[PDB]
Structure formats: structure tokens, C-alpha cells
Design an enzyme around this catalytic site. Structure first.
Site, PDB file in Angstrom:
ATOM      1  N   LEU A  23       0.795  -1.125  -0.056  1.00 23.12           N
ATOM      2  CA  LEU A  23      -0.034  -0.214  -0.128  1.00 23.12           C
ATOM      3  C   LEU A  23       0.861   1.313   0.006  1.00 23.12           C
ATOM      4  CD1 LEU A  23      -2.317  -0.968   2.764  1.00 23.12           C
ATOM      5  CD2 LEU A  23      -2.918  -1.292   0.367  1.00 23.12           C
ATOM      6  N   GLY A  24       1.849   1.228   0.828  1.00 25.55           N
ATOM      7  CA  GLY A  24       2.643   2.370   0.883  1.00 25.55           C
ATOM      8  C   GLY A  24       4.141   2.065   1.144  1.00 25.55           C
ATOM      9  N   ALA A  27      11.654   4.004   2.862  1.00 29.58           N
ATOM     10  CA  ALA A  27      13.152   3.683   3.197  1.00 29.58           C
ATOM     11  C   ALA A  27      12.865   3.076   4.694  1.00 29.58           C
ATOM     12  CB  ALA A  27      14.269   4.386   2.855  1.00 29.58           C
ATOM     13  N   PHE A  28      12.414   3.777   5.504  1.00 28.52           N
ATOM     14  CA  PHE A  28      12.305   3.650   6.791  1.00 28.52           C
ATOM     15  C   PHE A  28      11.364   2.215   7.075  1.00 28.52           C
ATOM     16  CE2 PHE A  28       8.310   5.356   6.037  1.00 28.52           C
ATOM     17  CZ  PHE A  28       8.659   6.583   5.441  1.00 28.52           C
ATOM     18  N   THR A  30       7.644   0.138   5.142  1.00 29.93           N
ATOM     19  CA  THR A  30       6.444   0.097   4.113  1.00 29.93           C
ATOM     20  C   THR A  30       5.232  -0.805   4.898  1.00 29.93           C
ATOM     21  OG1 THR A  30       6.416  -2.142   3.231  1.00 29.93           O
ATOM     22  CG2 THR A  30       8.551  -1.112   3.181  1.00 29.93           C
ATOM     23  N   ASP A 140      -0.156  15.223  16.638  1.00 35.05           N
ATOM     24  CA  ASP A 140       0.098  15.156  15.189  1.00 35.05           C
ATOM     25  C   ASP A 140      -1.301  14.747  14.504  1.00 35.05           C
ATOM     26  OD1 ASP A 140       2.111  13.552  12.646  1.00 35.05           O
ATOM     27  OD2 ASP A 140       0.716  15.263  12.695  1.00 35.05           O
TER      28      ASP A 140
END
Ligand code: 8JC
Length: 292
Positions: A23-24, A27-28, A30, A140
Site C-alpha cells: 500500500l505505501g 526506506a524506513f 513499508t 499530530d
């Protein structure tokens, strides 16, 4: 002087779920769509799995989010299903099929009615109020961090930065790193503005270095075209400098719930009345009906 957090943390075997798609991507880590089967239970649960390589500080970020997701139970907050202890620790939550709300009002702006917009504001205030009851601060809150289970049912997410994005920050937060439930009410206000503008970027063009000075002058985001002064006034109240003067989330429920009872008195959308929004799946169960 707080109560013992007896929430249960479930450890899931990598064998218990299949990843079906990406889905997304970062680098950190997925995010995957997938299906999870409790081992002896004969159900299938559509889940989303968050996971790449791990610095030692990387795993400490994902576990705080799991600690926070596991201690919340509310119809408008994303629930953790469990974590998987493979080399890169996987966080497993409920699949929110219609994706993130920010993307959703942009893709469907020409079919989104005032009754949905007012319901989303109600549902989000309910989530945030539950978080305030549980003495948590999001830090956030933004339309990008609200996920769409159905078009009728959104949930708050992204607890990575939760404790006990300058354009969504409160002024006190920008100057003195102060964070409150009332500083959360500010970002609520900015979040409602995003929805009322169908995903417009707040203070578009203005760089974040400029945001702190503007707000001190008394400038605020502008009244969205569809907004009656009633809706817009509530946004503006969330943006007072005196944080005791901003509203509480329980009052935002009440107010937006009053308006969701006659939505066209408070949002004026062209053609508002005409708009309407939507292997083997036999043993399939949404997370919200899977209780432990
Ligand atoms: C506001 C942006 C944002 O948060 N986007 C995003 C992207 C990937 C994963 C998550 N997290 C997440 N997502 C879902 N459900 C979900 C998100 C996005 C899609 N899309 C859009 C992009 N796409 C392609 C092919 O380009 C595929 C469809 C689909 C779905 O679900 C079907 N559910 C849960 C999460 C969670 F927050 F991580 F749990 C958010």
C-alpha cells in the site's frame, strides 16, 4: 496517580498472515495490505502490516506506537491487532480500505456531502475526546492521520509521536514545545479546515519559518467557501492564543453533532442533496467484530 494499564499485547506468528500487496512505501518501513488468521479460530481478518532494515533506534519508534495502540479501545481510534517479532518488527492493525481521509476528500470532493463532513468532525472529536479521557496527547492530528474504514466511519491514527507539522501546530507548541489536549484542539481546527476545503494545503506557499510570526499578529486560516459563519466560528475558537479559551473535545462533539442534525443549514455545497458515497471471503470478519 494513575491506574494500571492492563491492556493485552498479542504476539502473532509470521505464519498466521499473508501479505497480498504493498500500500505505501518508505526506506524506513513499508505498509502492506494483508490477511490474518488467528491460529485456531477459523476467521480471516483484513489487516494492514507496517514493517525495512532496522537501526536500533528504529524498533524503539514502532514499539511506542504499539504500546499506545494496544491501550486504546474506541470506535474512532485505530486498534492494534498485534505485533510480529520477525527481524524487522511488524505492527499489525485493521485494514482501513478507503485509505487516508486527506486523500479521500481530494479524490471525491465532487461527491462529498455536508452530512459526511459534519459526521467526520463528530467522529474525530469523539476519538480525540476518548484520547483526552485516557490522558493522551496525539501531537499530530491532521487529515493525513485519519483513516477511512467506510465513508461513514473514520478513525484516528499515527500515535508514533503521542505523549502524556508546523501548519497544524498550536502557537504555544511552536514557541515553547508545549503540548496539551488544548494544543490538540488547535490541530483539530486545522484538520476541519482541510476537510471543509476538500484537502487544500493550509497556508499554501507560506514557509513554516514564517508561520510563527503570522499567528502572533492575529492572522488565521481563511473561511472556507462552503462554511457558514457557525462552522467557521468554531474553527476560529480552536485557534485562540489563550488555550483555556479554545473548546474542549466534548463540546466539539455536541456542537458538530447539533449541526449534523440539519447539515445544509451549516454547510452550503452545490448539489449537496444528490451525492452518495459507497479468494474466498466467507470466513471474513472485520477487526471491529474480532474481540479478545
Ligand atoms: C494520508 C496518506 C496515507 O496515510 N496513506 C497511506 C498509504 C499507505 C498506507 C497507509 N496506512 C494504512 N492504509 C490503509 N489502507 C489503505 C491505504 C491506501 C490505499 N490505497 C492508496 C494507494 N494505492 C496505490 C495502488 O497507489 C493502493 C490503494 C489502500 C488502503 O487500503 C486498501 N489501512 C491502514 C493503514 C495503516 F494506518 F497503516 F494501518 C496510509
Amino acid at each position: 496517580g494513575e491506574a494500571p494499564n492492563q491492556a493485552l499485547l498479542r504476539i502473532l506468528k509470521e505464519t498466521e498472515f499473508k501479505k497480498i500487496k504493498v500500500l505505501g512505501s518508505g526506506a524506513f518501513g513499508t505498509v502492506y495490505k494483508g490477511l490474518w488468521i488467528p491460529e485456531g479460530e477459523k476467521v480471516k481478518i483484513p489487516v494492514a502490516i507496517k514493517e525495512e532494515a532496522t537501526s536500533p533506534k528504529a524498533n524503539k519508534e514502532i514499539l511506542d506506537e504499539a504500546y499506545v495502540m494496544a491501550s486504546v479501545d474506541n470506535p474512532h481510534v485505530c486498534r492494534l491487532l498485534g505485533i510480529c517479532l520477525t527481524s524487522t518488527v511488524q505492527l499489525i492493525t485493521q485494514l482501513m480500505p478507503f485509505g487516508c481521509l486527506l486523500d479521500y476528500v481530494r479524490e471525491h470532493k465532487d461527491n462529498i456531502g455536508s452530512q459526511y463532513l459534519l459526521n467526520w468532525c463528530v467522529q474525530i472529536a469523539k476519538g480525540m475526546n476518548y484520547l483526552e479521557d485516557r490522558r493522551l496527547v496525539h501531537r499530530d492530528l491532521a487529515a493525513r492521520n485519519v483513516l477511512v474504514k467506510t465513508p461513514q466511519h473514520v478513525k484516528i491514527t499515527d500515535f508514533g509521536r503521542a505523549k502524556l507539522p508546523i501548519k497544524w501546530m498550536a502557537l504555544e507548541s511552536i514557541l515553547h514545545r508545549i503540548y496539551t489536549h488544548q494544543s490538540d484542539v488547535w490541530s483539530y481546527g486545522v484538520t476541519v479546515w482541510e476537510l471543509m476545503t476538500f484537502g487544500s494545503k493550509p497556508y499554501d506557499g507560506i514557509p513554516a519559518s514564517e508561520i510563527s510570526s503570522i499567528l502572533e499578529k492575529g492572522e488565521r486560516l481563511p473561511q472556507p467557501p462552503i462554511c457558514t459563519i457557525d462552522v467557521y466560528m468554531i474553527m476560529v475558537k480552536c485557534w485562540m492564543i489563550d488555550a483555556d479559551s479554545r473548546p474542549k473535545f466534548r463540546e466539539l462533539i455536541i456542537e458538530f453533532s447539533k449541526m449534523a442534525r440539519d447539515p445544509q443549514r451549516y454547510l452550503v455545497i452545490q448539489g449537496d442533496e444528490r451525492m452518495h458515497l459507497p479468494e474466498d471471503m466467507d470466513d471474513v470478519v472485520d477487526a471491529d467484530e474480532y474481540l479478545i
